[PDB]
Amino acid sequence: MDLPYYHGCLTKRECEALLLKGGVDGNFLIRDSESVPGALCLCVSFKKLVYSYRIFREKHGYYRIETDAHTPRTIFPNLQELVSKYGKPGQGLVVHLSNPIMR
């Protein structure tokens, strides 16, 4: 991958160091998941903590963000359209996506 806010070389602590000493809730980036290998994590700052949402790549190249058990399966044909959705308030996250931390 290719997008500016996707960091691939990036530990959890490193990302938390870059998200928290950012300032505003709404700081976000994408990184590789450490728990589910091959998955991604949308990470955003909110209330002095990072909130991570795993992203699964599926069969035909879809991106499937982890939704809870009472929320419809929500998939995106690419990654910028997933980030485009969560830039809008009240979409299911703890805070919407405001400030991209670039690599």
Binding site: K12, Y51, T67, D68, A69, T71, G92, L93
Partner: peptide, 10 residues
């Protein structure tokens, strides 16, 4: 850690 894992809710 200082990361909370969460799921989308809408």
């Amino acid at each position: 850690s200082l990361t909370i894992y969460a799921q989308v809710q809408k």
